[PDB]
Design an enzyme around this catalytic site. Structure first.
Site, PDB file in Angstrom:
ATOM      1  N   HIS A  41      78.309 -33.672  26.150  1.00  0.00           N
ATOM      2  CA  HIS A  41      77.745 -32.590  26.649  1.00  0.00           C
ATOM      3  C   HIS A  41      77.661 -31.310  25.566  1.00  0.00           C
ATOM      4  O   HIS A  41      76.848 -30.294  25.567  1.00  0.00           O
ATOM      5  CB  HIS A  41      78.394 -31.911  27.997  1.00  0.00           C
ATOM      6  N   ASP A  84      81.271 -38.902  29.214  1.00  0.00           N
ATOM      7  CA  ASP A  84      81.146 -37.802  28.208  1.00  0.00           C
ATOM      8  C   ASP A  84      81.576 -37.961  26.974  1.00  0.00           C
ATOM      9  O   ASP A  84      82.336 -37.094  26.552  1.00  0.00           O
ATOM     10  CB  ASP A  84      81.522 -36.534  28.916  1.00  0.00           C
ATOM     11  N   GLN A 177      87.067 -23.482  27.886  1.00  0.00           N
ATOM     12  CA  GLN A 177      85.544 -23.285  27.323  1.00  0.00           C
ATOM     13  C   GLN A 177      85.886 -23.030  25.657  1.00  0.00           C
ATOM     14  O   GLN A 177      86.477 -22.230  25.218  1.00  0.00           O
ATOM     15  CB  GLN A 177      84.952 -22.087  27.850  1.00  0.00           C
ATOM     16  N   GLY A 178      85.035 -23.864  24.946  1.00  0.00           N
ATOM     17  CA  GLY A 178      85.368 -23.912  23.451  1.00  0.00           C
ATOM     18  C   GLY A 178      86.154 -25.047  23.177  1.00  0.00           C
ATOM     19  O   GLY A 178      86.154 -25.324  21.695  1.00  0.00           O
ATOM     20  N   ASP A 179      86.821 -25.709  24.088  1.00  0.00           N
ATOM     21  CA  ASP A 179      87.729 -26.646  23.687  1.00  0.00           C
ATOM     22  C   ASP A 179      87.250 -28.167  23.798  1.00  0.00           C
ATOM     23  O   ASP A 179      87.458 -29.101  23.507  1.00  0.00           O
ATOM     24  CB  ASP A 179      89.030 -26.769  24.591  1.00  0.00           C
ATOM     25  N   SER A 180      85.922 -28.435  24.413  1.00  0.00           N
ATOM     26  CA  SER A 180      85.149 -29.180  24.625  1.00  0.00           C
ATOM     27  C   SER A 180      85.154 -30.177  23.712  1.00  0.00           C
ATOM     28  O   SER A 180      84.940 -29.808  22.453  1.00  0.00           O
ATOM     29  CB  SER A 180      83.865 -29.140  25.410  1.00  0.00           C
TER      30      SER A 180
END
Length: 224
Positions: A41, A84, A177-180
């Site tokens: 993603h 993912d 959020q931002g660690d994905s």
């Protein structure tokens, strides 16, 4: 990362930060000199020219070695939260040495055991919706949550056999959020997953959900 601590130099030597359009975006794991593993993603559906990888630095903005992308391959069954993972090929090869290394991957058919300790790292927010993101890498240790418990939290169909869960029941420790795309490792330092999704961050009774390297290893091996 919520509830974490500062990473030290030489921690996670395979980790990369991934910017998009010059701004923070996600994390990843250096598999070999020309290959990064991230979440699908993070890259699916976006122009590849927007991305830059940085390796060998605690900072996401400066230091280390950078590369643009030559290609992007998402898992062939990627959809939404499921399957993912993506393989990125780098335009500039990145050698191991110093504070750069390559990840060691979980075996095909493996699955993390409930209650075992895992460590996740990244440059994401330290609160849900956070207005600023750290420059330097953070990390947090959380236990694996059984797939059955995670299914009771999210729904039976929501958690597939290509996902695993980790977190503390009372909350407070999680990826954000931002660690994905960035790494979660087991207590042997083997890469077991990538940050994928969850209901908010660090909420009680909603574990973080991770894409399972063990489950998706054949894809990884085909293209790495």
């Amino acid at each position: 990362i919520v509830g974490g601590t500062s990473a030290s130099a030489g921690d996670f030597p395979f980790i990369v930060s991934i910017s998009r359009n010059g701004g923070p975006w996600c994390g990843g794991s250096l598999l070999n000199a020309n290959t990064v593993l991230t979440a699908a993603h993070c890259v699916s559906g976006y122009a590849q020219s927007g991305f830059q990888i940085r390796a060998g630095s605690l900072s996401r903005t400066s230091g280390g070695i950078t590369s643009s992308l030559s290609s992007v391959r998402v898992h062939p069954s990627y959809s939404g939260n499921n399957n993912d993972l993506a393989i990125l090929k780098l335009s500039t090869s990145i050698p191991s040495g110093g504070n750069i290394g390559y990840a060691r991957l979980a075996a095909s058919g493996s699955d993390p055991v409930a209650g075992s300790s895992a460590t996740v790292a990244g440059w994401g927010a330290t609160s849900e919706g956070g207005s600023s993101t750290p420059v330097n890498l953070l990390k947090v240790t959380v236990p694996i949550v059984s797939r059955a418990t995670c299914r009771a939290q999210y729904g039976t169909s929501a958690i597939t056999n290509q996902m695993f869960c980790a977190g503390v029941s009372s909350g407070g420790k999680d990826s954000c959020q931002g660690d994905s795309g960035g790494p979660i490792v087991d207590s042997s330092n083997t890469l077991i997953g990538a940050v994928s999704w969850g209901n908010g961050c660090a909420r009680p009774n909603y574990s973080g959900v991770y894409a399972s390297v063990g489950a998706l290893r054949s894809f990884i091996d085909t293209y790495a």
